[PDB]
Amino acid sequence: VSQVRQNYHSDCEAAVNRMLNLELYASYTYSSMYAFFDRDDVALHNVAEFFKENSHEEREHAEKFMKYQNKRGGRVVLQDIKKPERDEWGNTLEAMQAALQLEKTVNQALLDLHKLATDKVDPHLCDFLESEYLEEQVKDIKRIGDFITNLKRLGLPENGMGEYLFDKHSVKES
Amino acid sequence: VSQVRQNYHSDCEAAVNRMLNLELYASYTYSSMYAFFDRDDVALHNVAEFFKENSHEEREHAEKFMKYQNKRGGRVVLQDIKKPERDEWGNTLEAMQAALQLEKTVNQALLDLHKLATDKVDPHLCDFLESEYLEEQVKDIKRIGDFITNLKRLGLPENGMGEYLFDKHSVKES
Amino acid sequence: VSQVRQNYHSDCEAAVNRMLNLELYASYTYSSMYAFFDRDDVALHNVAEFFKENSHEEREHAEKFMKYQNKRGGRVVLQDIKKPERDEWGNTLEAMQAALQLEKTVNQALLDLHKLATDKVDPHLCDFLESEYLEEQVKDIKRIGDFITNLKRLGLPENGMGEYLFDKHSVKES
Amino acid sequence: VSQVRQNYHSDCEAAVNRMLNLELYASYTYSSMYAFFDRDDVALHNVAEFFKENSHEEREHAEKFMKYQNKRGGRVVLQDIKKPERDEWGNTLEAMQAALQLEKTVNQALLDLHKLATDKVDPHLCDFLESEYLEEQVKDIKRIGDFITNLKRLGLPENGMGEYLFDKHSVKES
């Protein structure tokens, strides 16, 4: 038993390792979307940079779980980071639809981890999830939903001028 | 009944007074460790100052419970602050082992108070403990565990040079 | 064929994707070493931070290959990022020995990619490797070799005081 | 023989003069595109300025070959600068397609000069091309490819609003 460990269930320790892996998986998916929008035959550089920044934030989310695991006296166990589900992402609308689903998958895993922490009476882990993960997920889901609504209004997938304008006006200039 | 009181169970009020006392007890134990490491025949001044600062922080933790009690309309009831369990603390390793156990005793009391607040459906008290006490405890337990690991690596209790080096490099220069 | 593609052999495109994967693998190994040295029962925080920074630099190396692939008109193809070879890294000497071998594995792959680029008469890819990767590898191998020499001089693995001193004096304060 | 000449083959000297001429030809073509987009019946001033700046950069590329020739002890020999292939450039898409082909013609000549320098065992000339010309060509080809992809998305040649928007958002405001 780690000398620091107190009120930290083995099941929560394992679930934190699985959550860590899912954050790395989400990072890698966003890396793939960055590389796709940087292609010469796609060439939507502000969209590409949005996904690159998301990739970096998800890696930071994973590192924060590593630090958390060690603070509680659990032991980080790593698994392979699976490659993303697609090699090419169609267009900005298809990519944003995939991002929305990814963010809701990550959110569901965080909510499931909160349920487990509640069941094991771990208020520190509950607070960590509520204070560091759950609100950022709601905000990032809302942002992507707003983007999808605007891509549909702009006539995606058919309206190339609409796609061009989204990249200029909806995502930060990079 | 206090005019401000709302959703504040008598049992939680009493448990806050007991928690207040335990914070003052923890403060006093750290005061004792400060005075020990300041002795001419101990003379580890950065270690002494680490414990002095901890003593001040635990007193602040107690004062925050006094303020909390009054905000909720409970009534502060003080009891004697018991003297520490030891008059002398051996060496840096023995003192840090005692500090780890003290921090885990305080943490267990905070977790038990959270259980009571949960049972009495007091989300304000739950939030107060999660936001003001529980993460600071996990961080301070991790810090002391890290110190104990390093004191063991440095050959305590036998290796006086190791003890000297810990005071120079592991705790803040004071 | 990509409209930008010129003098870019399919074999080099594929080898760049494999090199990208190896950089991500190296990043992940360094992440594992960071988490290990951050454990409460290891607690060498400057060593941990050295490996964390290396993890970030290797991820940047991977991203630079993604950008390169797209500049040449190749297509990024991602594969799983395999978990590191170990779950625990022993001590600073064992970890640095593993880091030296990892850096020489990455260097050999870069040298093999340079051989392929030379065979396919691709001076742009040769210059990219020489200007962005090969000297950084020689410098980072030299740094790790110097560290191993010093860890041996400090009596690793047995001399815990030597290990403590390496973390204070050989790696940057973090 | 020039007193400075060392390891500089007559064939490389002649090929540097031909490359100089091609840079001046590329400059002149971009000058023509500037003047076309500045016409009152074309009037895409940011596109015009993009091509004007490219014209200046290609002239600088030529001057750098003149300086190189003299540094090695070769003798600059100038030939006529041929007028561009067209007197009018259609629209932004046709001009960018012509620019892509021009940049790939210049790139092929630079790669052919690198082959010759390699055959004549001239590492100074190889380094000069790799360090001063080949990466700038890959970057400028990628930029023009990205532009063509966006002009197609914006509905060129038929979509005049798309052409107008490209000039406002894709090229620098001038």
Ligand SMILES: [Cl-]
């Ligand atoms: Cl536990």
Ligand SMILES: [Cl-]
């Ligand atoms: Cl408990």
Ligand SMILES: [Cl-]
């Ligand atoms: Cl358990």
Ligand SMILES: [Cl-]
């Ligand atoms: Cl696990």
Ligand SMILES: [Cl-]
């Ligand atoms: Cl699997």
Ligand SMILES: [Cl-]
């Ligand atoms: Cl796919």
Ligand SMILES: [Cl-]
């Ligand atoms: Cl998903």
Ligand SMILES: [Cl-]
């Ligand atoms: Cl949050």
Ligand SMILES: [Cl-]
């Ligand atoms: Cl449409």
Ligand SMILES: [Cl-]
């Ligand atoms: Cl607009």
Ligand SMILES: [Cl-]
């Ligand atoms: Cl605007």
Ligand SMILES: [Cl-]
């Ligand atoms: Cl009440």
Ligand SMILES: [Cl-]
């Ligand atoms: Cl109520």
Ligand SMILES: [Cl-]
């Ligand atoms: Cl009551």
Ligand SMILES: [Cl-]
């Ligand atoms: Cl009481």
Ligand SMILES: [Cl-]
């Ligand atoms: Cl008593």
